[PDB]
Design an enzyme around this catalytic site. Sequence first.
Site, PDB file in Angstrom:
ATOM      1  N   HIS A  54     -19.005  29.388  -4.596  1.00  0.00           N
ATOM      2  CA  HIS A  54     -17.817  28.978  -3.865  1.00  0.00           C
ATOM      3  C   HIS A  54     -18.047  27.846  -2.865  1.00  0.00           C
ATOM      4  O   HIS A  54     -17.068  27.255  -2.450  1.00  0.00           O
ATOM      5  CB  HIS A  54     -17.102  30.156  -3.262  1.00  0.00           C
ATOM      6  CG  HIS A  54     -17.616  30.604  -1.965  1.00  0.00           C
ATOM      7  ND1 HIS A  54     -18.357  31.738  -1.718  1.00  0.00           N
ATOM      8  CD2 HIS A  54     -17.240  30.120  -0.788  1.00  0.00           C
ATOM      9  CE1 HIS A  54     -18.539  31.859  -0.405  1.00  0.00           C
ATOM     10  NE2 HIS A  54     -17.820  30.871   0.193  1.00  0.00           N
ATOM     11  N   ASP A 100     -21.147  34.848  -7.710  1.00  0.00           N
ATOM     12  CA  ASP A 100     -21.066  33.801  -6.696  1.00  0.00           C
ATOM     13  C   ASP A 100     -22.432  33.238  -6.360  1.00  0.00           C
ATOM     14  O   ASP A 100     -23.014  33.506  -5.288  1.00  0.00           O
ATOM     15  CB  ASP A 100     -20.342  34.302  -5.462  1.00  0.00           C
ATOM     16  CG  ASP A 100     -19.922  33.210  -4.492  1.00  0.00           C
ATOM     17  OD1 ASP A 100     -19.980  32.026  -4.892  1.00  0.00           O
ATOM     18  OD2 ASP A 100     -19.533  33.557  -3.339  1.00  0.00           O
ATOM     19  N   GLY A 136     -18.764  29.587   7.106  1.00  0.00           N
ATOM     20  CA  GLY A 136     -19.753  28.574   7.417  1.00  0.00           C
ATOM     21  C   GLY A 136     -21.171  29.066   7.182  1.00  0.00           C
ATOM     22  O   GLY A 136     -22.081  28.258   7.040  1.00  0.00           O
ATOM     23  N   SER A 146     -21.609  30.956   4.504  1.00  0.00           N
ATOM     24  CA  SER A 146     -21.541  31.089   3.048  1.00  0.00           C
ATOM     25  C   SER A 146     -22.632  30.312   2.371  1.00  0.00           C
ATOM     26  O   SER A 146     -22.893  29.187   2.698  1.00  0.00           O
ATOM     27  CB  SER A 146     -20.232  30.650   2.506  1.00  0.00           C
ATOM     28  OG  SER A 146     -19.244  31.493   3.038  1.00  0.00           O
ATOM     29  N   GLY A 147     -23.233  30.940   1.337  1.00  0.00           N
ATOM     30  CA  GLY A 147     -24.262  30.281   0.550  1.00  0.00           C
ATOM     31  C   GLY A 147     -25.669  30.531   1.079  1.00  0.00           C
ATOM     32  O   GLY A 147     -26.642  30.271   0.397  1.00  0.00           O
TER      33      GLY A 147
END
Length: 223
Positions: A40, A84, A175, A177-178
């Site tokens: 995402h 994801d 923020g 994320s990942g």
Amino acid sequence: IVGGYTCGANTVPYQVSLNSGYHFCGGSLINSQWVVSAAHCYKSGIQVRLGEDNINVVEGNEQFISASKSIVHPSYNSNTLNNDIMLIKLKSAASLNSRVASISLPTSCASAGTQCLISGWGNTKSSGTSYPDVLKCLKAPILSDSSCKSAYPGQITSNMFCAGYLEGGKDSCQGDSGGPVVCSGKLQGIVSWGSGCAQKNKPGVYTKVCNYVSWIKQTIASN
Ligand SMILES: [Ca+2]
């Protein structure tokens, strides 16, 4: 990260910032040429920023390297966030030293109750907005699959796990994320989703990296 602490400069050497003019997601360095992040977080025009602490100041340990290729998981579903995960190859190999280092992939999955370190430059407020300049950290346990599914009925797949605190107050956020979830020195999770941040009975939901190690290795081997 809500309810965490300042990590310390370069104490999380595998943590990267994905920059497209501005920080927009985290990632994890898994070898000199490859970063794993959340699907995402995909966009074009990514610059990977390694060796960061303050993302708004050049402090001396940075390596900025353009992505040459991004690979979103073949089965990523943006509606459910199942699978994801994405891989990003760097145009050139990073130089590895104690402040910039790859994180080991898991050879086995982690269990409920294991403590993990979650890190990133995301929002630090749960009913507010404040984005830090320096890297934030949170120690958090993996939660049981049953408490995960109870928190989020009909939404938790075999490729997701929950970590954090049901009481609220301590979580990853927008923020982050990942970014990494590292448990006993292995990359077990990727910051993926959750309802709000740090809300009661709404823990963080993470991509279960151990399910992806075969895909990650074969992809690296052919790209
Ligand atoms: Ca910097």
